[PDB]
Design a protein around this nucleic acid. Structure first.
Ligand code: MG
Lengths: 97, 165, 165, 48, 236, 83, 66, 65, 165, 50, 36
RNA sequence: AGCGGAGAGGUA
DNA sequence: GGGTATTCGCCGTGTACCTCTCCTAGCCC
């Protein structure tokens, strides 16, 4: 099975899992360790931010693919904002200076 | 169901400039398209004869007539009748604006402004007019823009407006 | 290629009066071999009712369509149920599946030859060197003969070697 | 606080009020910036 | 998975779906009859089948088999096939626990298995309106509507493909032209949503089971299969 | 539920910072964090699909359910903002 | 029902009514050049719909991105 | 890829230079000698294009824009 | 905290798109830098590039007609898929990645099958057998990611082991 | 109000890549399908399948 | 999709052409198949 | 109509 | 006031994938 773009979860902006409902393959931690062992800054940045996590980033990358121009703008993952909102619910102030 | 459509066609939204004859022709054309989509052999025109202000719904088929037709539910026929109805309503509104432009009077027009783009403006006189510079009461009359409905063209500054004043 | 039976809708149902299933009848029809003299298509029908076995010789054949005597049975009938079955023969080569080509579909293996073996032996003949001979034992299903098989094999070789020059 | 005893490191950073300068490899994955190793060293050189 | 004869006797009445035995005076008032399952799905989406092996007019004893079950011979257990094996490296195609297959193991249909899938279409009741099983679906071409009947569902024994509409289901999603179209028709002109059952795996449809609730008017196909079931139980 | 005009605009967040500071939170700062006070432990009322006012799932505290819509339905336009 | 600019193109207008987006391209004189309707359930995905609207705005007279 | 590791010592600088040359070639420009990245690596390995010439072409494209 | 928390399941390891998995077989005819890829799998993975090339070639005015032409599966979409995949590397990954060389880049070719063919000199570094082994693939789509996969992730560049010489 | 269950029977053939094990624990995966003319044959002409 | 492409490498010493050698080989094989 | 928490079995 | 000597807790213990079922249901009419 394979997929290009399917449905996304609402708790965190990430694709689903499994052969059903067009789930994506989980890019594990050891694969991220191997890509960090390769170096590969631009490959690892476009893997866990642009393709998976960012809402506007995947739309901008998709329209830049179908338009022909090359202008990649990265952003913060939404799961980091979920973690910030979950830490702030524990009466602990976490600010992005 | 004869008066239930009579309470619908009698609205003054599209029957103020041109009366309910062309709306009846649009309804007859939509039901003829539905009967042609229901029948497997669609090569002749069907006549849906509806009388004036009574609403007797009867479907015929002329090939001069050959046989009778019969309606059905037709959800795809309902979608086809909807697009033929809105296309014929657009055609009738284009006919209404062009005959109100071309049969009332060809002379100076008086209206208020509605929109203003970069180097252009729109003058409302339910017809829309263009403001050429190459509320206002300029004297200019021309016919163009045959696709998307013909619209009248006035000007903000014209020598005919100075000659008439 | 295809089998058309009036009482059998799809290839997974059960018909009254038959001991085996429909898939056993389809495999037994795939097992038999049919030799046709002329033509690229044919249609054979069979009619067998009452108790008793159904062989390949019980079908109705044409003058050009020749059937092997068929000691292998097709199905087994028990009750007094009529079996009206229509077949279709087509020409081809190799193996064609049912996907890439109340109507049934059957696979076809267009290969009359089962196994080919050969061995090279030496022939004591007064010549300039040691000339060797070879023997080829062809085992078929009775459809094709061993002479026209190697004749069309040499024809295929001469048509394939015609690209050079 | 990435692999073991998240509560202890979290309450220590909450009491002391530490400031993470993001000079690492895993925290750039968490934040979402480039990795400061390999092809991403020029971006970190041009940033500072 | 196999049936066994409790009392031996004459098997003079035999069919592919049922086996009728006739007991003797020593074992016996009525005779015994064994019904065989033909094609039903298992728990692992596989096909189970019971094909008979006895003939017409042969005596048996207590304990003899009458129909071989799924993956079962005449009394031995059968899991696979028998085929020629050669232990030799062949051009790297059997490199590291890889298997090489010929054309003769494929063209004779030795490993062809039958899988039976369960696809359901559930018609819930919503607040805007109940979903129907009508066949008139907008924005659907006739090429996907030829296999549908007047009931809205597919026929029995129809070759479908991936993406084919098997059960046609619509749901209501809730300008003067729309009012004119709603008055010209019988309140079924527009405001509908297409949500039908599609095939995810191409094959034939072997059985269509329709479940209905009380207080709902039955469909003509449901009435037809009800007549078929009562004719079948009256016949047997 | 469904919105397509707001979905097209991008580059709204820059996400450019240097460090991350974590500290404690004063009760006045927690009061300045939130937008409303909850008082009832009712999330969703029975026999209707509508959120409960002043509950865990409320529109007066967190936000509306449907996009550019209220609970009653007095404002059903995209031009009304900040009202 | 008012055509609202999507704030991604200098010459673009959009209108959504029942999960159907009406996108039109206006001329600098004010006349609408082209107009098409794009559904949501036919695509089944978000960036494919974004790519469709972007390609329809780029091929049918996209002068600038302001 | 051995000649590309021969004309420059560092590998990541070669990756960044080939990325800049592929970004310049993908917008549409005449190459020095079919994919844009493969043509950029072939122009790098042939000692035809330099980083200063890449910066000059990028400055010319920024001035022309 | 924990393994199933919001820190280990959504921040370090994330689910990614443009990816799929399949079983692996052995391919002796392949080279070291290239590997096999199924036709439908590569059509599902390289779908945006296929859509962009179909928009550039002029075979479809909108992406809806291009999507219907992809699902119709004619020969032109195979020509587009063969022209796109020619110089585009993909990242093949083993499901355990304890090795440094668990992720390698290959130039895929289109095969008529349902599995991912692999060179026999690759599975030694992957420590992968050929009995029920599955490998997840990933495609880089940016130019920097493609050049990084060509330079420092190719199988021809990773000859020596990271542990010893 | 109504439930419709449709039984779909698919008959799948053998494909290159399918897992097939023996009787003593020697599992394997089919590499490719080879014609009969390329398979090794004995002295009598019987072609080996596997 | 299932088609075979044949590539033959010929290294002649130089007394005859390689295409001429392939042509005479095909002619010899054609005569040996046409005699039978 | 999409967003999920347990329990069981199986493969590498 | 101050050193051993137990002792109560705190915290952790591989990755990836594929099928299936079952989810708060209880009561006085
Ligand atoms: Mg293994």
């Amino acid at each position: 099975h394979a997929r290009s773009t399917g449905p996304y979860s609402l708790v965190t902006q990430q694709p689903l899992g499994g052969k059903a409902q067009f789930g994506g393959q989980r890019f594990g931690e050891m694969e991220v360790w191997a890509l960090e062992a390769y170096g590969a800054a631009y490959t690892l940045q476009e893997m866990l931010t642009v393709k998976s996590d960012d809402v506007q980033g995947r739309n901008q990358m998709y329209k830049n693919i179908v338009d022909g121009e090359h202008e990649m703008v990265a952003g913060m993952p939404e799961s980091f904002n979920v973690l910030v909102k979950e830490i702030r619910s524990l009466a602990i102030h976490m600010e992005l200076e | 169901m004869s008066k239930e459509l009579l309470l619908v066609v009698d609205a003054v939204a599209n029957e103020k400039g041109v009366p309910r004859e062309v709306i009846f022709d649009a309804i007859e054309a939509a039901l003829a398209s539905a009967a042609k989509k229901r029948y497997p052999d669609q090569d002749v025109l069907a006549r849906v004869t509806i009388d004036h202000k009574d609403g007797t719904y009867e479907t015929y088929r002329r090939w001069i007539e050959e046989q009778i037709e019969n309606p059905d539910f037709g959800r795809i026929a309902a979608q086809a009748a909807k697009q033929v109805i809105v296309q014929r309503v657009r055609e009738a509104e284009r006919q209404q604006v062009v005959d109100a432009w071309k049969d009332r009077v060809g002379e100076l027009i008086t209206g208020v402004v509605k929109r203003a783009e970069r180097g252009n403006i729109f003058v409302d006189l339910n017809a829309e007019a263009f403001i050429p510079k190459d509320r206002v009461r300029g004297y200019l009359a021309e016919v163009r823009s045959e696709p998307r409905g013909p619209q009248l063209f006035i000007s903000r500054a014209a020598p005919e407006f100075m000659i008439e004043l | 290629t295809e089998v058309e039976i009036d009482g059998v809708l799809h290839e997974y149902t059960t018909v009254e009066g038959l001991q085996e299933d429909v898939l056993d009848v389809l495999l037994n029809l795939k097992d038999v071999a049919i030799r046709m003299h002329s033509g690229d298509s044919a249609t054979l029908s069979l009619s067998k009712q009452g108790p008793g076995t159904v062989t390949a010789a019980d079908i109705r054949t044409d003058h050009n369509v020749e059937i092997i005597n068929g000691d292998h049975v097709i199905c087994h009938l028990t009750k007094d149920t009529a079996l009206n079955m229509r077949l279709k023969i087509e020409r081809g080569f190799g193996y064609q599946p049912a996907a890439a080509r109340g109507r049934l579909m059957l696979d076809a293996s267009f290969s009359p030859v089962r196994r080919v073996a050969y061995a090279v032996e030496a022939a004591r003949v007064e010549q300039r060197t040691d000339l060797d001979k070879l023997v080829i034992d062809i085992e078929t299903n009775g459809t094709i003969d061993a002479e026209e098989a190697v004749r069309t094999a040499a024809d295929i070789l001469s048509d394939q070697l015609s690209v050079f020059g | 606080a990435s692999f073991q005893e998240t509560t202890r490191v979290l309450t220590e950073a909450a009491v002391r009020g530490t400031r993470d300068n993001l000079r690492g490899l895993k925290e750039n994955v968490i934040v979402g910036r480039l990795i400061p190793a390999g092809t991403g060293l020029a971006y970190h050189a041009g940033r500072r | 998975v196999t049936v066994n004869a409790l009392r031996g006797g004459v098997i003079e009445q035999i069919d592919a779906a049922r086996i009728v035995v006739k007991v003797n005076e020593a074992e016996i008032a009525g005779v015994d009859i064994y019904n065989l399952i033909k094609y039903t799905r298992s728990n692992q989406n596989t096909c189970i089948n019971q094909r008979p092996l006895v003939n017409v007019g042969d005596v048996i004893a207590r304990g003899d088999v009458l129909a071989d079950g799924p993956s079962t011979d005449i009394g031995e257990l059968a899991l696979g096939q028998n085929m020629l094996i050669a232990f030799m490296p062949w051009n790297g195609y059997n490199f590291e626990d890889s298997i090489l297959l010929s054309e003769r193991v494929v063209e004779e249909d030795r490993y062809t298995t039958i899988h039976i899938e369960e696809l359901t279409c559930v018609a819930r009741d919503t607040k805007l309106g109940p979903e129907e099983i009508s066949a008139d679906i907008p924005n659907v071409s006739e090429q996907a509507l030829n296999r549908l009947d007047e009931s809205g569902v597919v026929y029995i024994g129809a070759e479908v493909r991936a993406g084919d509409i098997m059960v046609g289901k619509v749901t209501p999603k809730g300008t003067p032209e729309e009012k004119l179209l709603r008055a010209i028709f019988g309140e079924k002109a527009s405001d509908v949503k297409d949500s039908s059952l599609r095939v995810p795996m191409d094959g034939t449809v072997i059985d269509v089971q329709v479940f209905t609730r009380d207080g709902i008017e039955k469909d003509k196909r449901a009435r037809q299969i009800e007549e078929n079931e009562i004719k079948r139980v009256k016949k047997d | 539920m469904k919105d397509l005009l707001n979905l097209f605009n991008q580059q709204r967040q820059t996400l450019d910072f240097d460090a991350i500071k974590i500290a404690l939170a004063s009760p006045d700062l927690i009061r300045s964090w939130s937008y409303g006070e909850v008082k009832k432990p009712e999330t969703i009322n029975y026999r209707t699909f509508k959120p409960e006012r002043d509950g865990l799932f409320c529109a007066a505290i967190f936000g509306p359910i449907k996009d550019y819509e209220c609970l009653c339905g007095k404002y059903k336009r995209m031009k009304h903002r900040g009202v | 029902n008012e055509f609202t600019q999507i704030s991604g193109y200098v010459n673009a207008f959009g209108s959504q009514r029942g999960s159907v987006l009406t996108v039109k391209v206006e001329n600098d004189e004010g006349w609408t050049l082209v107009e098409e309707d794009f559904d949501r359930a036919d695509y089944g995905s978000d960036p494919e719909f974004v790519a469709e609207v972007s390609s329809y705005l780029k091929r049918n007279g996209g002068i600038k991105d302001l | 890829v051995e000649d590309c590791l021969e004309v420059v010592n560092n590998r990541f600088e070669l990756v960044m230079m080939a990325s800049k040359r592929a970004r310049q070639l993908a917008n549409g420009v005449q190459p020095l000698i079919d994919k844009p990245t493969v043509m950029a690596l072939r122009e790098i390995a042939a000692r035809r294009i330099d980083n200063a010439l890449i910066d000059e072409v990028e400055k010319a494209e920024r001035e022309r824009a | 905290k924990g393994k199933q928390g919001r820190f280990r399941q959504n921040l370090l390891g994330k689910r990614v798109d443009y990816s799929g998995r399949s079983v692996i077989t052995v391919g002796p005819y392949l080279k070291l830098h290239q590997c096999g890829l199924p036709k439908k799998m590569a059509l599902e993975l390289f779908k945006p590039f296929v859509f962009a090339k179909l928009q550039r070639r002029g075979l479809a005015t909108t992406i809806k007609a291009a999507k219907k032409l992809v699902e119709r599966e004619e020969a032109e979409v195979w020509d587009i898929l063969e022209e796109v995949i020619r110089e585009h590397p993909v990242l093949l990954n083993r499901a355990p990645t304890l090795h440094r060389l668990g992720i390698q880049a290959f130039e895929p070719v289109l095969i008529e099958g349902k599995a991912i063919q692999l060179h026999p000199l690759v599975c030694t570094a992957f420590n992968a057998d050929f009995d029920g082994d599955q490998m997840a693939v990933h495609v880089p789509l940016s130019l920097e990611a493609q050049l990084e996969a060509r330079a420092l992730m190719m199988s021809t560049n990773n000859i020596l082991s990271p542990a010893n010489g | 109000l109504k439930m419709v269950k449709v039984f779909l029977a698919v008959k799948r053939r053998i494909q290159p890549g399918d897992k097939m094990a023996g009787r003593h624990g020697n599992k394997g995966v089919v590499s490719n399908v080879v014609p009969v003319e390329d398979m090794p044959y004995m002295a009598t002409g019987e072609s080996v399948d596997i």
